[PDB]
Amino acid sequence: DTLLDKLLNADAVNTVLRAVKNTADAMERGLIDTFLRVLLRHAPPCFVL
């Protein structure tokens, strides 16, 4: 740790953290997406209803 270790350690930690945070974004939007798609599959059109 001549701070080369510190920047590589923070780089690996930030890679893990950025993967998990993009995962949280993708997971919440996928919940949004497939809830919307289920609602579309169970929603008949306007003229029909």
Partner: peptide, 20 residues
């Protein structure tokens, strides 16, 4: 000092809005 400034500015003073 130069080394801690490599960690401070050349990583980014804010860990948000970017990461150098």
């Amino acid at each position: 000092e130069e080394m801690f400034n490599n960690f401070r500015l050349y990583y980014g003073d804010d860990p948000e809005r970017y990461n150098l």
